[PDB]
Structure 1
Amino acid sequence: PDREKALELAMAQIDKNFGKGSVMRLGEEVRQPISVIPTGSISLDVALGIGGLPRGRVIEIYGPESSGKTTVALHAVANAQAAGGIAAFIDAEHALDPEYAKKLGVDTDSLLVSQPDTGEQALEIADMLVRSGALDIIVIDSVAALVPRAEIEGVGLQARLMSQALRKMTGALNNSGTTAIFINQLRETGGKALKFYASVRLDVRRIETLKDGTDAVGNRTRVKVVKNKVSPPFKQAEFDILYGQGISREGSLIDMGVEHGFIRKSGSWFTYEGEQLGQGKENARKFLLENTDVANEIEKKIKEKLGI
């Protein structure tokens, strides 16, 4: 009696026992909710299937040095921040640059910065800040730097601390309603536990170096949503990170503009239905940069063509 009906019968019997994303089809458009924090990268949001990182979920962002993971996060902050939310940053790398975070929309001033000493203590104050219901987004910098009492003193495994604090904190993170980012690094650890708690796990790798006549004006980044318990996994995205300026909205809107037929070429001269923007993205960008009106609706043309 019909696979289709037998499958969906049981397939449903499944979500009931293991949450939602317990099972999915790479096709499915669905949803049935939101709370969702913009990432400043439209490409990544549509590639996330929900328009941004879900709130109340634990998210892991791993990749090499200079990839982007931090920039994304800081952006995530800026958004969940400029939307009346309270951001908590547990720094264990002591590498964060305010002047860069500020230049992205992060109200640094009202940004909590806890500088732990023990990977154990970090997760503690990180967990409390979570239970205090006030925070909406918390971001731990370095799942690496989260070393225990020992090691920092003088056998076992760091991962135990992780499984511990993660076991306890995933739950609370839910009812609480705070999305928690975990930057992980490239040594190519507690990583295992995390990998299995993250409702969304993103892989961030720097695909190619940007150039605009001068030199290194930034970098191209490709993100692969390798784990996605909210929407369908394995989707991906790409955006432009400008050396000291964040993600390039304007540029991101172009990549979309052409991929979604709104913008056109013809001599490499990017043009939006009639009017020209200029030859070579570096100029069409400069075009969208100043003219917000056009850019605005190019966003509004693309943002409509897809989910929400």
Structure 2
Amino acid sequence: PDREKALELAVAQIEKSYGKGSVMRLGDEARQPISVIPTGSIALDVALGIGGLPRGRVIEIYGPESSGKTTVALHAVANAQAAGGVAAFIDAEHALDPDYAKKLGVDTDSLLVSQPDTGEQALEIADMLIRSGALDIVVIDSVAALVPRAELEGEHVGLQARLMSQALRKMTGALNNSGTTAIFINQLTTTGGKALKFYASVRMDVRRVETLKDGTNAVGNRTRVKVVKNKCSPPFKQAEFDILYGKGISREGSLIDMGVDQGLIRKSGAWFTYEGEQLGQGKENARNFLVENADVADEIEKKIKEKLGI
């Protein structure tokens, strides 16, 4: 009785002294912001607690080569644009496929792109963009590619981490004020991510778990994402979803998964049913049905959000 108040007091002082998400019980509900950047998977949006990526914060998305981390980033870009936002993409990798981006939903024509000469030029340009107040989202591809000028110009070793540290402490204020989200893509956490690990409000570990198949042909990959860090909602939640080659994150696939998870979609055998109606036999028909019938896919989306507050 007398200790329940001391803990509430303790938590409050921590909250006041260090910020809103400085301590949380893992069973807590998330405090919902006004706006967020949805990820493309409702499952991931739920895993993040606040229904998507936070605004005015640093995000890290890391994983192996071709884990899907860039696909997740590009979906964040599409949704930011889809709600009238402007996007930028700081590219030190030169791997971007705009056609793939296009099929996800990215307005590539409007997408600001920069291919900077050095790591510090990359971060300075990003910061220049962020302070404009005009961007909703900027993506940095990638952390490891942010090679310092000195190293590129042929000149001890350790200053890439120092470059990130310096840049992030300056960038973090610019992001809060602007309400711009910065997503750092990072490989396997790798060459400056040790500062990013503490500056990031969200960190997402992205991985392939199995190849999806249409008979013997590889159509895509089931993808798993763990929110290892989350300052806006309890951390350590994970989600799975499908990335289909040439299309990206199957929005409809996630609606079904979370649909059955939430009891909104029942399962009379291999038949997925919704509201007395039938959606399809097997996952693909249920999936294909939802894209062909966008109105019911939004019905299922609104219902899932209502049950969880997302």
TM-score of the superposition, structure 1-length normalised?
Answer: 0.96
The 1:188–1:205 alpha-carbon spacing in structure 2 relative to 1, beyond 3 Å, is farther
Task: Give CA-to-partner distance per residue, 1:103-139, whole Å, 9 cap, x none.
Answer: 1221111110000110111001111111111111000
List gaps (5 residues or longer) in structure 1.
Answer: none
Question: By how many angstroms is 1:146 displaced?
Answer: 0.5
2:200 & 2:190 partners in 1: Cα distance? 20
Is the 8 Å Cα contact of residues 46 and 307 (structure 1) preserved in structure 2? no
1:70 — aligned with what?
A: 70
1:126 — aligned with what?
A: 126
1:218 — aligned with what?
A: 220
Question: By how many angstroms is 1:261 displaced?
Answer: 1.1
Other structure's SS at 2:144 match: coil
Is the 8 Å Cα contact of residues 30 and 234 (structure 2) preserved in structure 1? no
List gaps (5 residues or longer) in structure 2.
Answer: none
Structure 1 ranges of 4+ moved more than 3 A: none
Q: Determine which structure has the larger helix proportion and give its number.
A: 2
Other structure's SS at 2:149 match: coil
The 1:30–1:99 alpha-carbon spacing in structure 2 relative to 1, beyond 3 Å, is closer
Is the 8 Å Cα contact of residues 34 and 50 (structure 1) preserved in structure 2? no
2:270 — aligned with what?
A: 268
2:203 & 2:189 partners in 1: Cα distance? 17
Is the 8 Å Cα contact of residues 138 and 181 (structure 1) preserved in structure 2? yes
Count of equivalent residues: 308
2:273 & 2:103 partners in 1: Cα distance? 29
2:117 — aligned with what?
A: 117
Other structure's SS at 2:221 match: strand
More deviation in 153-162 or 251-260?
A: 153-162
Task: Give CA-to-partner distance per residue, 1:263-299, whole Å, 9 cap, x none.
Answer: 2223322222433233220221112121222222111
More deviation in 214-223 or 111-120?
A: 214-223
Is the 8 Å Cα contact of residues 253 and 298 (structure 1) preserved in structure 2? yes
| 2:308 is the alignment partner of 1:301 | no
Task: Give CA-to-partner distance per residue, 1:165-206, whole Å, 9 cap, x none.
Answer: 011101111111100000001289101000010011111111
Is the 8 Å Cα contact of residues 204 and 222 (structure 1) preserved in structure 2? yes
Is the 8 Å Cα contact of residues 54 and 179 (structure 1) preserved in structure 2? yes
Question: By how many angstroms is 1:57 displaced?
Answer: 0.3
| 2:190 is the alignment partner of 1:185 | no
The 1:145–1:232 alpha-carbon spacing in structure 2 relative to 1, beyond 3 Å, is same
1:81 — aligned with what?
A: 81
The 1:30–1:142 alpha-carbon spacing in structure 2 relative to 1, beyond 3 Å, is closer
2:237 — aligned with what?
A: 235
Other structure's SS at 2:60 match: strand
The 1:184–1:69 alpha-carbon spacing in structure 2 relative to 1, beyond 3 Å, is same
1:194 & 1:296 partners in 2: Cα distance? 36
Task: Give CA-to-partner distance per residue, 1:236-279, whole Å, 9 cap, x none.
Answer: 11111011101111111110111111222233222224332332
Other structure's SS at 1:40 match: coil
The 1:81–1:188 alpha-carbon spacing in structure 2 relative to 1, beyond 3 Å, is closer
